[PDB]
Amino acid sequence: KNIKIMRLVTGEDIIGNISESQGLITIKKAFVIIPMQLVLSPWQPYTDDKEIVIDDSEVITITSPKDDIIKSYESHTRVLENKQVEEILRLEKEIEDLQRMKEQQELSLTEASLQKLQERRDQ
Amino acid sequence: KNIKIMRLVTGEDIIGNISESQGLITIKKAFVIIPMQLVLSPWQPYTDDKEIVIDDSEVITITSPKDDIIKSYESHTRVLENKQVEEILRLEKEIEDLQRMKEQQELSLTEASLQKLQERRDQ
Amino acid sequence: KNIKIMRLVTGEDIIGNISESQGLITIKKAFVIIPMQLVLSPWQPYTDDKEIVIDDSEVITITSPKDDIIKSYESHTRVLENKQVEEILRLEKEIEDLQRMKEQQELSLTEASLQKLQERRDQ
Amino acid sequence: KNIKIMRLVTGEDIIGNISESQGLITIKKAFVIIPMQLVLSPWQPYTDDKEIVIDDSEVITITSPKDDIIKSYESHTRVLENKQVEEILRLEKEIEDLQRMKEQQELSLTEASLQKLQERRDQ
Ligand SMILES: [Ba+2]
Ligand SMILES: [Ba+2]
Ligand SMILES: [Ba+2]
Ligand SMILES: [Ba+2]
């Protein structure tokens, strides 16, 4: 584990897990720090990739942060995971309930209705 | 097929498929006729059984109806089946969409998060 | 266990545990279903008998219900038992407290007062 | 086919078909993603070239996107083509109608008028 803040050539502050292998660096769980206490936002809200590879030629400064920001970052990154798991449980329960109710509703049906059901499902 | 209206000892009018075997009669797709044009309602809205067996000692009159009521009954009994099939398709599509979205959401997860997911699902 | 709804000659819907032995049937934990969701009420609120015996000649239809009503009936029949037990605990605690307080109050008394107490209790 | 979102040094998000051959990359059907649901806009609205060649030294991150954005991008890129074809049909029909009407109008003319027509067309 290695948490190091950095400043991008664009002019923004990125905090996350860093790995510097061969110049090009790998970033995990990156967060944009908005100056405003502190506010953190997702860096790449359009991708699900765990790691993002960038080039060291496009980063200005890489430095270790103070402990308060470390605590805030850890708290935020565990709250997000907890909420994600809670939503997964909610979705699974709703899916199970809907499937059971649909099964019971479909159970009471006639033969011709079942044939029409199959035909329209095929269509 | 045999459609015969009847009047119950309670004082209500039941229309549906009738079968008189050994005194006790079997009724399918029974409908209560409300005097008000004509209005039909389900007879036993708390059961999913296709056939209901009653005793001939508890029915006053059993007579064949006119053609207009036959047409209305057939129209209503096909509209109900059509709506039932449409709702079955709606439910199946919603279930499939929800399952797919939950699968994609669960795909992006970490190992420790997956372990916590499994533990809480077991609980 | 056997839950079957039935319709009485009076024109009401009874749900509960049923046992058909020799024509005459035994009913346990009967509930009147009021058409209004669903609302259930006690059938015989003036008796404490667990089982009630009626005659099959006085019942119109006996049919198995759908699963939603089964779930509602089970929930209601466990909530009633839970509330009954809670009230039993409340009454026992109140009785114990009152008895203890009366005992301490009676402890501080004189001999002539005790004799008058005994005489008036005898009266 | 290969759809990968990327972030430019300018600070914008480009989604489209990507091909990385020799460092310099080729982009087809590029779209600017405006953060606002999602909104997509054309990247180069002043050129008709199918492919645009850029340099990898001018791109920060290249990552695969999630499925929702893929679906939205495919829907938008088929709607645009459908509308383009519809407009082509509209224009062709209008041109044919105008040409036919002009032909019929020109048919009814005199010899001297035809000579003046030819002279002024030559001018
Ligand atoms: Ba540097
Ligand atoms: Ba009779
Ligand atoms: Ba009977
Ligand atoms: Ba690069």
Q: E strands, B1-123, where?
A: 5-8, 13-22, 24-34, 39-42, 51-54, 59-63
Tokens 């029915």 -> residue: B59
- Amino acid letter, D90: R
Between the CA of A7 and the centroid of ligand 1 the distance, in Å, is 10
A104 vs A106: CA distance, rounded Å: 5
Residue from the list A99, A108, A116 with its beta carbon closest to the beta carbon of B85? A116
- Residue A23 DSSP class: S
Would you tell me the crossing angle of helices B67-107 and A67-107 to the nearest 10 degrees?
A: 150
> Is B107 touching A (CB cutoff 8 A)?
yes
Write down how long chain A is: 123
Gap between the Cα atoms of D56 and A54, Å rounded: 11
Half-sphere exposure (Cβ direction) of D92: Cα atoms closer than 13 Å? 6
Ligand 4 centroid to Cα of residue A73, in Å, is 27
Q: Is chain A touching chain B, with at least 3 CB–CB pairs below 8 Å? A: yes
How many whole angstroms separate alpha carbon B4 and alpha carbon B60?
A: 13
**Rounded Cα distance, B115 and D10, in Å:** 41
- The ligand placed nearest to the CA atom of residue B8 is 2
Q: Which residues of A touch B121 (CB under 8 A)?
A: 89, 92
Give the residue among C35, C15, D66 at the shortest CA–CA distance from C6: C15
Question: B touches which chains (3+ CB pairs under 8 A)?
Answer: A, C
CA dist A117 → A66, A109, B28, B87, B99 (Å): 64, 10, 21, 11, 21
| Number of neighbouring beta carbons within 10 Å of residue B15 | 23
- Residue A98 tokens read as 């809907």
Place of tokens 């011709």: A112
Contact D19, D29 (CB under 8 A): no
Of the CA atoms within 13 Å of residue B95, those in its CB half-sphere come to 16
Tokens of B83: 């709506």
Q: How was this structure determined?
A: cryo-EM
Residue C35 dihedral angles phi and psi, to the nearest 5°? -70, 110
Distance from CA of B54 to the nearest CA of A (A): 21
CA R_g for chain A? 24
CA distance A6 to B109: 25
Nominal resolution (angstroms):
4.0
CA–CA dist C6, D8 (Å, integer): 73
Closest Cα in chain A to B93 = A121
Which sign does the torsion angle of CA B113, B114, B117, B122 carry? negative
**Cα-to-chain-centroid distance, residue C97:** 26
Among partner residues A48, A91, A101, which is closest to B102 by beta-carbon distance? A91
Is residue D57 within 8 Å of residue D47, measured between CB atoms? no
Give residues with Cβ within 8 angstroms of A36, minimum separation 6.
Answer: none
Which residue do the tokens 């051959």 mark? D21
Angle at C68 between CA C64 and CA C73, to 5 degrees: 80
**Element housing C111 (H / E):** helix C111-122
∠ CA B95-B98-B104, rounded to 5° = 140
**Chain B residues within 8 A of C64 when measuring between CB atoms:** 47-49
Give, in degrees to the nearest 5, the angle at Cα D7 between A46 and B111.
Answer: 45
Q: Identify the three-state secondary structure at position B70.
A: helix
Across the interface, whether the CB atoms of D69 and A46 are under 8 A apart is answered yes
Place of tokens 């990507």: D18
| Residue D75 DSSP SS3 | helix
Tokens of C27: 């009913």
Residue in this structure with the two tokens 């979102």, named with its chain if needed = D5
Tokens 């496009």 — which residue? A58
Nearest CB to B81; choose among A84, A106, A113: A113
Cβ-based contacts of D60 with chain A (< 8 Å): 8, 54-55, 58
Q: How far is B8 from chain C (nearest CA, A)?
A: 10
Say if residues A40 and A33 touch (Cβ distance below 8 Å): yes
Phi then psi for residue B25, to 5 deg, are -115, 155
CA–CA separation, A92 and B105 (whole Å): 11
Extract the tokens encoding A106. 């479909």
Residues belonging to chain B: 123
